[PDB]
Amino acid sequence: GYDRHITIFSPEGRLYQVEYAFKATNQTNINSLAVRGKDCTVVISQKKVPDKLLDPTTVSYIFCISRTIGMVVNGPIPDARNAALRAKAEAAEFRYKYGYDMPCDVLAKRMANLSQIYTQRAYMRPLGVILTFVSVDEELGPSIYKTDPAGYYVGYKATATGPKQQEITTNLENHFKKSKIDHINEESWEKVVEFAITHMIDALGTEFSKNDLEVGVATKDKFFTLSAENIEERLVAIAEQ
Amino acid sequence: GYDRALSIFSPDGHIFQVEYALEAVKRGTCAVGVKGKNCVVLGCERRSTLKLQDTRITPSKVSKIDSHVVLSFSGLNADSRILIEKARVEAQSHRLTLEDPVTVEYLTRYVAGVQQRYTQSGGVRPFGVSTLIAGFDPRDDEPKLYQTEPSGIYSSWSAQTIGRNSKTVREFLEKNYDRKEPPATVEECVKLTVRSLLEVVQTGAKNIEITVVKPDSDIVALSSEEINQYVTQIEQEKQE
Amino acid sequence: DRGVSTFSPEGRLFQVEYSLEAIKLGSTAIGIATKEGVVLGVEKRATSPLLESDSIEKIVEIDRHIGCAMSGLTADARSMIEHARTAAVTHNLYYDEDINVESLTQSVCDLALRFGELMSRPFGVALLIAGHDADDGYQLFHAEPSGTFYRYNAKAIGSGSEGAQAELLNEWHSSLTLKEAELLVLKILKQVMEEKLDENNAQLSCITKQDGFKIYDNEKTAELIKELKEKEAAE
Amino acid sequence: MTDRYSFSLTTFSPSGKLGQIDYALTAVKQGVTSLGIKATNGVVIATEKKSSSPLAMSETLSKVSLLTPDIGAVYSGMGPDYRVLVDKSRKVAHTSYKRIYGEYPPTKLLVSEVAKIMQEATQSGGVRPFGVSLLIAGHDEFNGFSLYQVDPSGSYFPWKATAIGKGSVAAKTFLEKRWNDELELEDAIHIALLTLKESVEGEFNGDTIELAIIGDENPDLLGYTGIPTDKGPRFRKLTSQEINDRLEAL
Amino acid sequence: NNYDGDTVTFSPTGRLFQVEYALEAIKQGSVTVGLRSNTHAVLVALKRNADELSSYQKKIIKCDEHMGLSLAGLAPDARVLSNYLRQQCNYSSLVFNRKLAVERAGHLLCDKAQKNTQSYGGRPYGVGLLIIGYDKSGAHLLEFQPSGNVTELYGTAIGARSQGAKTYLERTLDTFIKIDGNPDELIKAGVEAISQSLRDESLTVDNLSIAIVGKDTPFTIYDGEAVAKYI
Amino acid sequence: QFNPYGDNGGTILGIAGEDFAVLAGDTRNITDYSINSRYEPKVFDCGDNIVMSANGFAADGDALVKRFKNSVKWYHFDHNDKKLSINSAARNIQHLLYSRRFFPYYVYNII
Amino acid sequence: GSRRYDSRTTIFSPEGRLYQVEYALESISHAGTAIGIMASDGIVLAAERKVTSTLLEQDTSTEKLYKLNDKIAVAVAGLTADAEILINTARIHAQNYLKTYNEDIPVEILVRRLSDIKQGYTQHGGLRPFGVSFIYAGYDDRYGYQLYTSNPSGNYTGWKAISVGANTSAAQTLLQMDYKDDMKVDDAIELALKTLSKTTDSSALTYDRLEFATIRKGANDGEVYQKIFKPQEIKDILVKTGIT
Amino acid sequence: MDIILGIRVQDSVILASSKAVTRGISVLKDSDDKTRQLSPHTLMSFAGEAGDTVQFAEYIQANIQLYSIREDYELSPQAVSSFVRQELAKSIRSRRPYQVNVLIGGYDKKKNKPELYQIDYLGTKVELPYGAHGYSGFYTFSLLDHHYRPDMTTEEGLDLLKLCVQELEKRMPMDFKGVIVKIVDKDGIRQVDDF
Amino acid sequence: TGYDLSNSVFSPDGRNFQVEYAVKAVENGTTSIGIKCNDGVVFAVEKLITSKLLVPQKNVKIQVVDRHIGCVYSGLIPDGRHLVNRGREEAASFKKLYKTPIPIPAFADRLGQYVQAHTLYNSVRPFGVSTIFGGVDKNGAHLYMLEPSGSYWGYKGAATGKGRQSAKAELEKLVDHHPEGLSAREAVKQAAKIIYLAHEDNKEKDFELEISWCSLSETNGLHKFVKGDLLQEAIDFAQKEIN
Ligand SMILES: [Cl-]
Ligand SMILES: [Mg+2]
Ligand SMILES: [Mg+2]
């Protein structure tokens, strides 16, 4: 039974190492959520600092890949940082070679192709991560593109990743079924972040303090992460209505 | 590159891959070599399971390495082509760098060295081939007959056989071949070579190939009718 | 399966230990060192009477002052001999002198452990390297596939080795002559050999300071065999 | 490091079977149904857009892909394997043909190049075969319209019409009854939609179906005017609206 | 068991069995003792023979004028590692006109051995080394294990029955460290130390091997009748 | 253009006696018309009772001597502390010089 | 490390056989039968396509018979994809020879070259062999008309008549019975089709299940012509010989 | 080296090549054979830069002999000439080209025809009834243009060749020390020992 | 089963058992700690005295990278040295190209990526060490701890080896009782205490204390070993607290 150790086909036509890489994705026990506004793309993720000896400022699963592209990862941090470093290098090389900023969907495809190679070549293992890329693309507008260990990728109106992804997914599905539009009809990104947090609270059924969350925001020509005090201001506005 | 060690020692001190290569030689068609006083004859078996064969174009069992040296074999046919090609290249390479054709002993030592190299190199299996190399050294009238095998050892023989049922024909040669007085003529040498193959071959029709090599690059292959005359004369004397 | 360079739980390299078993199956080779020279002798062991025994070359010249006998998978020795001859003559090129027997032996033994996954396996042959130099005089070395080499006053390798080594234990002394050593090799070879010893199935050789390395003729060895028979019948 | 898998991962078993190719074909069988039909004046290729989530934008995932202006492709099996094959197929059409002869390759030769790539993944060291079967439709001046299937082994066959994947056995039977040598392109599209409806469970509309054609030259899609000989691509992907219009006359 | 097939595999308890098996080869090897004072450093080695006709395998190797070692285990591996030390000592002299520090020599051996324990295909070294030397910070003694671990010591011993000599040195610690400016007395302490590891056999003229290095003493090896003085 | 060679002047003299030998050389080191040093040793004791001097381009001269001293050291390691004879040293030095046949050590050497 | 997963494709069995070559031959025995018959005035190549479909485009299809150059052609039995790799190599080799010597490559030299490539995969590299057996039909001015076969072992032999693929045992017996040395092309065409018709696993032998080709000096004066038969032409020769 | 001539008559090819070898201002040898037998019915003469000539000729010889053994068959003069041309055309764009000019005289046993090929160091091949390299043609071609017929006998070919050598000996400033003449026909290659 | 026999193989859990077995080698090693202070960091390690023959203060375990970074580790010592050698190459190439000395977070990722790379293939073994490291850069003090998996985080206090639980408990008390912060000289004293308290898990053999530190005020932001009177003062403070 060596067909379960390396990335070759089983008699059922399956790749067990890819399937087990998907299971490593939930090892951190963290849930992430991504939504699109009119002018922005917001990504939120649970932040859990169990040890008091940890420096909480260094605990993060959100990455600034380029000025325009942000990435949240679902999976162990070593593989997350492996993917982050590669995506940063690819984004920079793209700009140098082709004279314009690498689009979010193109980077997603590139990282998805690299992941495909690990599913076909035996010596390389799959990375046990799911990569959610976000930006406000200059051609396509607000964009969410997500990659997995199978080498699969697709664009999203909104998305969720983690152990409780289904609960969040259905919550978002039901909202877009009402509004009948592909985004959050809101002017400011502040209110889009408030929407994201509110709907994660409703879906998971847990309250959040400023240190329990981690937020990334993509606007035209820049992606940035929010500080704890920026998140606190967001939580106050939610509670006051 | 593929570096896997395929030929390795076993607890009892054997290299099984080299020994299994000898089993491939055992499966191969019988080849025999007999040296007379002024010649060497190479006999070869052709299995008659394959009829409808085109004997004009089918690869002959005996191969010229140079104008004065020949090589026959037993074992895997495809493997033998690689050794023959290498041997032919080395023969021309020797003429080019030393201005003399190879001696039969030198050519044998080279081929044996190639076989040995394939028993302790990574990512390769041994040649499933044993060879009989015969000829005459330049400006020399003493006959030469050598044998090689997959392990890479080689040695000189007054007469020798290899391949399937070689045990039987070697038995015949050991009692029939006299060292003090070897086959004085070409006839006697060919007759003894045909007789030895008739112990094993089955039918004496197109199953026996004979190649006579004489001094000074005089190499000829006997035809079916010429061999058939030897087959006829042997059995007529036997009916007594 | 398993690595080629793997250690056993006892702390030995499996492949090196297995190659030693192949050497035990080889034909007997004996070496005896004296102050008048070093004698090397081997069992030829022809597999058939049609095999021309003089073509069996198990004793070999490395240089004028160094000889070599082999036992085991003798085909593996050819590349070792080629390296030894090259090393011996190359040193003569670089330093305008003969190379020390120990230094030559060390050069051969450096090849031994160059195997892995370089060649794919260790050598399956042991060598008795005999020679003479001005510094250490007449010397006899035993080169193994482990990369180890021991100097010996007398040594036997091959199938009848432990029986021959016990005999060499009793017979060897520091005042042996060359003639005495020759007869002693023949005596012990005759003892361990399956077939009856004669000039055709056994070979002698020696290395002296004056005449260098010499392989003995079959006529010369035949007389030494006849001389042996008479002296054994003398008591 | 170094790729130390320099040996084949696909090997013959005692029965003569190449296991990894067979298992790759099993993966293709599990894949979503896709089909191709050849008409007198065109070719059609179609498949279902099996969306993994309703939140996912299925327009961004293209199962039917342009390889050259006159050649298109669709698949059944593992999507990521298909995506990289399309990248390689597009590139090999340039490197091994267009940069030499100054024109795009004919369908059969591009198929031959793709087939070669898939064969090498079946014999080369340290790789598994591609887990896809491709249907490649195309047109060229001297061979006219053509449709080819390519399997994980690297074997390829020309078809008048065929289907691969989930419900291929039933779909091929359906096509045998409907196909003739006098079909016009619109008739082939109609048959393609009928055949594809049998294998689809849920919604059946322009947003859940992906369909493209190889047909007449499209000068409106060329992007420039002034060169008479350049008349535009024959490959065209049908829009969501264009599919729905033909579903009313179904 | 299932985790000893190669050097690249940890066992479930975090052990590297191929390295431990390489360590076992040292225990089978003949005993060798190392010790030092503030002025000199001494190696003492019990050489082993194959039989009565054979010579006694050399145990001590010179690396530079100020440095050398003794071996226990696979002798060819010692030749490889000593050759590496010879080159490194020599690189330091040619490039920096600087005698190689004994501590740095130990760090280089550690790193060379380590690479063989983490990579596939290769094997660990099957030999233990005792390195002595005299540099700018005085006399030094190092113990090398093929796991990579190198340790600076006042005295030690490795090989078969080495525990006896190691205990003796542990008692004599305060005495032999003070033997300054007296090479013969320091060697005596080493010969007396290695004698605690002997059974049946005793120290003969062609059995014993001694080496010494110090303040105004280059690394020199004593064999044959040169060590009869200490028997 | 860069000229990798230079001339440091100096002169050396070797004379062989019946049971002795001398190797002499001046201690002046120069470039063009300037003096670099009035005392820069040029003749060296290389061990094994051999003396050596590489006269001409000082950088190549120092490099050769350094390499020969090294060759003596490794000759001891490789051949059981055997003394390197003068004829053996001479032949060794030939091979050191010819290793740069196409980018020569610009020195006239005497041992 | 990686050793764990290595099948070791290039090793001997205890009996002295090459595992992968033997298993490749087992694969080939399930492939469609291909037959070659050499006559005094030409060569015939006949081959059976495997269980086809009505929707297969036959006139543009090629799975059995391939052209190496103007003088030499091959019939394939085994993995088609593997065969095309080798075929393209052989086409290049023939052109290399033509460029070097300004003469068309002798048949045997081309055959030996391809057979040597197959041999290499059985002795080194650690890769699976090519699961292909060829029948070479060709002509040159030295030996005239020639038939050869090669298999995954890299061994090749010459033939007057030969079959590869499925039911070769039965097919070779039938060929050995009816073949004669003074035979002509038109007679050989009939023999090839009659042999396939009796050995086939199909219910009946039809035009759509066959590929056919001839190499004839039946070209205007001293020269050779290759004829790859079209579907309609195969249908006509089936009626002519009296099979359908 | 300097002068190499060639002429194709009715039933044979005749090659004439100078005997001189010069080094500095001294003629080291006056009996040098500037030719190699490539096969029993194919002869190649050569001229060019010192050392390169023999190395190239022997390399070609080795390749043709290798081919002969492998196939047990003699290549046609046309096939050999094409092989030689390709090697020279390959050589001219190398780091250090081989500066060798050759004439290939062979008898084709299949067509029963003599054949003469002229190939220069660039790889410029031409089939000719008569040919030369370097300055040799400047003196001799006018005689050959006048006297040559395709139905000439071997003896008439030798007489016309003598006239060419006599003209060279008269009008060249160079002493080439006479020529070695060799004939290539159906029976093989032989040397004319008196010329 | 068989998933634990080869590195880089995911088990059905989604775990790399070979990396988890490497952690067992770390847990077997001696105790090492790190303490982040007001303007720098302090490192300390337990050195087991196996024998009286060990020369005191000679077998140094703590290693410097560049001139501003300190590294200490528990587990297989050679593996740690290999990792530090790489770290030094990474720090050198960074300074070569960018001029400024490598920032601590930047340096942390360089090690992290290198250790993570040794979990991607079966042709290499994972690192058998957990490494505590850090120092002072332009943005202030940083302390990191890096595991065999390649996982690392920033820390206020860090501990690894056989006595890690005891150490962690002591570190947690300091964080609670000093929210405003801890001074560099205090951290050296506390580091000594914690190693002594953690030595109860290795109480069979006696040990030697080794401490180092980087501080903006006390060492000018350079890595230095704690020696002489300051070391003895810390030992005395530690000995007083256990009694
Ligand atoms: Cl890509
Ligand atoms: Mg993989
Ligand atoms: Mg010309």
Swiss-Prot record, chain C:
<comment type="subunit">
    <text>The 26S proteasome consists of a 20S proteasome core and two 19S regulatory subunits. The 20S proteasome core is composed of 28 subunits that are arranged in four stacked rings, resulting in a barrel-shaped structure. The two end rings are each formed by seven alpha subunits, and the two central rings are each formed by seven beta subunits. The catalytic chamber with the active sites is on the inside of the barrel.</text>
</comment>
<keyword id="KW-0597">Phosphoprotein</keyword>
<dbReference type="InterPro" id="IPR050115">
    <property type="entry name" value="Proteasome_alpha"/>
</dbReference>
<dbReference type="GO" id="GO:0019773">
    <property type="term" value="C:proteasome core complex, alpha-subunit complex"/>
</dbReference>
<keyword id="KW-0963">Cytoplasm</keyword>
<dbReference type="Pfam" id="PF10584">
    <property type="entry name" value="Proteasome_A_N"/>
</dbReference>
<dbReference type="GO" id="GO:0000502">
    <property type="term" value="C:proteasome complex"/>
</dbReference>
<dbReference type="Pfam" id="PF00227">
    <property type="entry name" value="Proteasome"/>
</dbReference>
<dbReference type="InterPro" id="IPR001353">
    <property type="entry name" value="Proteasome_sua/b"/>
</dbReference>
<comment type="function">
    <text>The proteasome degrades poly-ubiquitinated proteins in the cytoplasm and in the nucleus. It is essential for the regulated turnover of proteins and for the removal of misfolded proteins. The proteasome is a multicatalytic proteinase complex that is characterized by its ability to cleave peptides with Arg, Phe, Tyr, Leu, and Glu adjacent to the leaving group at neutral or slightly basic pH. It has an ATP-dependent proteolytic activity.</text>
</comment>
<dbReference type="GO" id="GO:0005634">
    <property type="term" value="C:nucleus"/>
</dbReference>
<keyword id="KW-0539">Nucleus</keyword>
From Swiss-Prot, chain E:
<dbReference type="InterPro" id="IPR001353">
    <property type="entry name" value="Proteasome_sua/b"/>
</dbReference>
<dbReference type="Pfam" id="PF10584">
    <property type="entry name" value="Proteasome_A_N"/>
</dbReference>
<dbReference type="InterPro" id="IPR000426">
    <property type="entry name" value="Proteasome_asu_N"/>
</dbReference>
<dbReference type="GO" id="GO:0010499">
    <property type="term" value="P:proteasomal ubiquitin-independent protein catabolic process"/>
</dbReference>
<keyword id="KW-1017">Isopeptide bond</keyword>
<dbReference type="GO" id="GO:0005634">
    <property type="term" value="C:nucleus"/>
</dbReference>
<dbReference type="GO" id="GO:0034515">
    <property type="term" value="C:proteasome storage granule"/>
</dbReference>
<keyword id="KW-0539">Nucleus</keyword>
<comment type="subunit">
    <text>The 26S proteasome consists of a 20S proteasome core and two 19S regulatory subunits. The 20S proteasome core is composed of 28 subunits that are arranged in four stacked rings, resulting in a barrel-shaped structure. The two end rings are each formed by seven alpha subunits, and the two central rings are each formed by seven beta subunits. The catalytic chamber with the active sites is on the inside of the barrel.</text>
</comment>
<dbReference type="InterPro" id="IPR029055">
    <property type="entry name" value="Ntn_hydrolases_N"/>
</dbReference>
<dbReference type="Pfam" id="PF00227">
    <property type="entry name" value="Proteasome"/>
</dbReference>
<dbReference type="GO" id="GO:0000502">
    <property type="term" value="C:proteasome complex"/>
</dbReference>
Swiss-Prot record, chain F:
<protein>
    <recommendedName>
        <fullName>Proteasome subunit beta type-6</fullName>
    </recommendedName>
</protein>
<comment type="subunit">
    <text>The 26S proteasome consists of a 20S proteasome core and two 19S regulatory subunits. The 20S proteasome core is composed of 28 subunits that are arranged in four stacked rings, resulting in a barrel-shaped structure. The two end rings are each formed by seven alpha subunits, and the two central rings are each formed by seven beta subunits. The catalytic chamber with the active sites is on the inside of the barrel.</text>
</comment>
<comment type="function">
    <text>Non-catalytic component of the proteasome which degrades poly-ubiquitinated proteins in the cytoplasm and in the nucleus. It is essential for the regulated turnover of proteins and for the removal of misfolded proteins. The proteasome is a multicatalytic proteinase complex that is characterized by its ability to cleave peptides with Arg, Phe, Tyr, Leu, and Glu adjacent to the leaving group at neutral or slightly basic pH. It has an ATP-dependent proteolytic activity.</text>
</comment>
<comment type="similarity">
    <text>Belongs to the peptidase T1B family.</text>
</comment>
From Swiss-Prot, chain G:
<dbReference type="GO" id="GO:0034515">
    <property type="term" value="C:proteasome storage granule"/>
</dbReference>
<keyword id="KW-0647">Proteasome</keyword>
<dbReference type="Pfam" id="PF10584">
    <property type="entry name" value="Proteasome_A_N"/>
</dbReference>
<dbReference type="GO" id="GO:0000502">
    <property type="term" value="C:proteasome complex"/>
</dbReference>
<protein>
    <recommendedName>
        <fullName>Proteasome subunit alpha type-3</fullName>
    </recommendedName>
</protein>
<dbReference type="InterPro" id="IPR001353">
    <property type="entry name" value="Proteasome_sua/b"/>
</dbReference>
<dbReference type="InterPro" id="IPR050115">
    <property type="entry name" value="Proteasome_alpha"/>
</dbReference>
<comment type="subunit">
    <text>The 26S proteasome consists of a 20S proteasome core and two 19S regulatory subunits. The 20S proteasome core is composed of 28 subunits that are arranged in four stacked rings, resulting in a barrel-shaped structure. The two end rings are each formed by seven alpha subunits, and the two central rings are each formed by seven beta subunits. The catalytic chamber with the active sites is on the inside of the barrel.</text>
</comment>
<dbReference type="GO" id="GO:0043161">
    <property type="term" value="P:proteasome-mediated ubiquitin-dependent protein catabolic process"/>
</dbReference>
<dbReference type="GO" id="GO:0010499">
    <property type="term" value="P:proteasomal ubiquitin-independent protein catabolic process"/>
</dbReference>
<dbReference type="Pfam" id="PF00227">
    <property type="entry name" value="Proteasome"/>
</dbReference>
<keyword id="KW-0832">Ubl conjugation</keyword>
